[PDB]
Amino acid sequence: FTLIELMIVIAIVGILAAVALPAYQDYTARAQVSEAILLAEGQKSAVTEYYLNHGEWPGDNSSAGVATSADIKGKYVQSVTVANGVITAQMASSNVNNEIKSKKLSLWAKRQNGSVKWFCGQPVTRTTATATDVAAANGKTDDKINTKHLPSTCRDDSSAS
């Protein structure tokens, strides 16, 4: 080899050092969102118990039996609220992945004739505690978790049934 070859390998080393990285932030966001998924799943038992014993979805954390929304917090989750039987988990606004900062995911259940189907995904809103249908929460701000940061099993749409 010669000096040109050494310069070429130095340039190749520089290329490798300055190589672009994949969307590892998306995978880290999924890992952190798993914590909110678990926190929301924790309240499923209470929500289902209230719905079965009263015939209507729990309006909020009070008669759902779960703790206060601000008190259900984890390392990356700042709140877990209940709205008409829909459990919405909102992540923290700091010390978390930038892609899921102060973003919300949802867990809602539809009562079937033989079972109760639980759906996890983007935020949804149930208008009435007795309603059997859900719809997207609202536009507002960027409070919706992108499907890139949700597991493929946690991307259920509002219209899904």
Partner: nanobody, 127 residues
Framework: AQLQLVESGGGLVQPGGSLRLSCASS????????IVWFRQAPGKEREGVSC????????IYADSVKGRFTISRDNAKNTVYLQMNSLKPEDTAVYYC????????????????????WGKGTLATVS
């Protein structure tokens, strides 16, 4: 998690007049309680008048007071205002403001049920 409710604004008023009752809540999570205005008249049991939810976008009023009473909430001042218009002689009572722990600031449901804390009450009479 004790909550203190103070009612103010009650007093004498003429029939067909306007009144405003302010219920101020001081506590750890006063903005987490649905605020329910009940009334009690001499010779009858306590009955609910108007409930406002934690989110403030869901308000329910009694049938006898629907269309005349308006309930609003201010979390910055931590006070709930009940405005009565076209007061009737049947409204002579004592009004209590009570807080129901909803466990969620964004709660859209509130009703006359087991209230965690109660207010002293203000005598609102019209003659």
């Amino acid at each position: 998690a004790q909550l203190q409710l103070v009612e103010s604004g009650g007093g004498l008023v003429q029939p067909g007049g306007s009144l405003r009752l302010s219920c101020a809540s001081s506590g750890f999570r006063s903005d987490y309680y649905a605020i329910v205005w009940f009334r009690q008249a001499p010779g009858k049991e306590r009955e609910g008048v108007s409930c406002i939810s934690t989110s403030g976008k869901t308000t329910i009023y009694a049938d006898s007071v629907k269309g005349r009473f308006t309930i609003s909430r201010d979390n910055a001042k931590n006070t709930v205002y009940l405005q009565m218009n076209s007061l009737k002689p049947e409204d002579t009572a004592v009004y209590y403001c009570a807080a129901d722990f909803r466990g969620s600031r964004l709660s859209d449901v509130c009703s006359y049920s087991s209230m965690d804390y109660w207010g002293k009450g203000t005598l609102a009479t019209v003659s």
